[PDB]
């Protein structure tokens, strides 16, 4: 959605703007988060 907003604008569809990742521990949700952070090419902010 951030890379190619043209497609979303074509159909008048908005990005969710927020996603909740959940599942039993050890699934890799944190792993996936860091992975996407690797290729984010933008400011990524963790929390404490």
């Amino acid at each position: 959605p951030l890379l190619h907003p043209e497609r979303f604008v074509n159909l008048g569809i908005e990005p969710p703007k927020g996603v909740l990742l959940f599942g039993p521990p050890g699934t890799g949700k944190t792993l996936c988060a860091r992975a996407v952070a690797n290729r984010t090419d933008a400011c990524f902010i963790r929390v404490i």
Partner: protein
């Protein structure tokens, strides 16, 4: 009301997240182990539109994870990953990493240079069929 401070902080957070005029370019991700405890206010879509559930990987996923982890390890090419993936019925990738490490350590203990399928299956027995698996394991003379 001992949590009043954290509660008001969370209320401010949710309000700034959505309501009136948000930025609209703030992609928020959230990782919780037990969302059931989360409040209705945050879980309600609009604030958190997408819900991505990370379930236990299936058989094929487990095979893929095994192959990904073990590739770095020094191991003979003749091992059957699919067999291992089957041997771990419902285990998260963390357990796969654990069994890889355990197999490597078993090999080291034997003063060997390459890991073999036996290393892997006894490691699996250690990391899964040794913590809670011991009930019908010895009396399997119920399933044939």
């Amino acid at each position: 009301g001992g949590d009043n401070e954290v509660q008001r902080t969370m209320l401010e957070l949710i309000n700034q997240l959505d309501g009136f005029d948000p930025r609209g370019n703030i992609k928020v991700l959230m990782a919780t182990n037990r969302p059931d405890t989360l409040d209705p206010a945050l879980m309600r879509p609009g604030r958190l539109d997408r819900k991505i559930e990370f379930s236990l990987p299936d058989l094929e996923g487990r095979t893929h994870i095994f192959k990904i982890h073990a590739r770095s390890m020094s191991v003979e090419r003749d091992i059957r990953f699919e067999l291992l993936a089957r041997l771990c019925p419902n285990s998260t990738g963390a357990e796969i990493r654990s069994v890889c490490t355990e197999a490597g350590m078993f090999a080291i203990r034997a003063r060997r240079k390459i890991a073999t399928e036996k290393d892997f299956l006894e490691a699996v027995n250690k990391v899964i069929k040794s913590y809670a698996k011991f009930s019908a394991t010895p009396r399997y003379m119920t399933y044939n």
